[PDB]
Amino acid sequence: ENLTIGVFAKAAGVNVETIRFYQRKGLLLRRYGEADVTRVRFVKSAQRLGFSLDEIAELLRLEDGTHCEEASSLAEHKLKDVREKMADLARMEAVLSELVCACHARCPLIASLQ
Amino acid sequence: NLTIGVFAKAAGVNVETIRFYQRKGLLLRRYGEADVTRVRFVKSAQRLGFSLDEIAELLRLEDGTHCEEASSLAEHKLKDVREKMADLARMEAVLSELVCACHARRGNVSCPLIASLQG
Ligand SMILES: [Hg+2]
Ligand SMILES: [Hg+2]
């Protein structure tokens, strides 16, 4: 059926503040139905995979599910970015671990920073 | 002693970065070796992921006689790095999975990425 702002949110499993947030950023479109629910879960899911608000708008451009080549591309690009970020964080984790190890085994941290 | 440009060269960083560091007040119109050492301190820390605030705290311990307190900042940072990696890893796993299914889609079936984003 059609639904009020509060029931919409309940059906979509999200805060009312989040529905409003999504409306102001224009990731949506009185009352609401199942397409709206599905649309909100679309956004929330994508957001959770690390897509930016902009990237999600592009992704929604392809919502009718007949542009697979273009969809993969957004995901593959995001994946590339994720992997770079992980490779950087990994480089930090390695050195930080190494510094701590030397801290406990004694200031080497400061020494190494200089 | 050294000019803005040579300072940066000696410190192995952009001029924009020296200025950046001055405006945020992590520094000490000439410059010398303490300034160089101080900039390498910041740049290094920044490269290990320390925030500008965390670096100010870390600089409080610059004389190298507060090992307990230093480790703590590093250990806390290390925890945060690992969390972030664990989150990114979660994304990477599902995204990889979606792409794999994108490339593998059969005939005229609807886009799995979108499908998964709606289910
Ligand atoms: Hg796809
Ligand atoms: Hg230490």
Residue numbers in the entry:
A (entry chain A): 6 to 34, 44 to 120, 126 to 133
B (entry chain B): 7 to 34, 44 to 134
According to the publication:
The mer operons are under the regulation of the mercury(II)-dependent transcriptional repressor-activator MerR. Upon mercury(II) binding, the conformation changes of MerR induce a local underwinding of the promoter DNA, which facilitates the formation of an open complex by RNA polymerase to initiate transcription. MerR is a representative metalloregulatory protein that exhibits high sensitivity and selectivity to mercury(II) in vivo and in vitro.
Here we report the crystal structure of the C-terminally truncated Tn501 MerR in complex with mercury(II). The mercury(II)-bound Tn501 MerR was crystallized as a functional dimer in an asymmetrical unit of the P3121 space group. Each monomer contains three distinct functional domains comprising an N-terminal DNA-binding domain (DBD, residues 1–81), a C-terminal metal-binding domain (CBD, residues 119–134), and an amphipathic dimerization helix (DH, residues 82–118). The long dimerization helix plays a critical role in stabilizing the dimer by the formation of an antiparallel coiled-coil dimer interface. In the functional dimer of Tn501 MerR, there are two mercury ions bound at the equivalent site. However, only one metal-binding loop in the MerR dimer is fully ordered. In Tn501 MerR, the bounded mercury(II) shows planar trigonal coordination geometry with the S-atoms from three conserved cysteine residues (Cys82, Cys117, and Cys126). The Hg–S bond length in the mercury(II)-cysteine complex is consistent at ~2.56 Å, and the largest S-Hg-S angle is at 127°. The angular deviation from the perfect 120° may be caused by a steric effect derived from the pyrrolidine of Pro127, which is packed above the Hg-SCys117 and Hg-SCys126 bonds. The Gly79 residue in the corresponding hinge region participates in hydrogen-bonding interactions not only with residues Ser125′and Cys126′ of the metal-binding domain from the other monomer, but also with residue Glu77 adjacent to the C-terminus of the α4-helix.
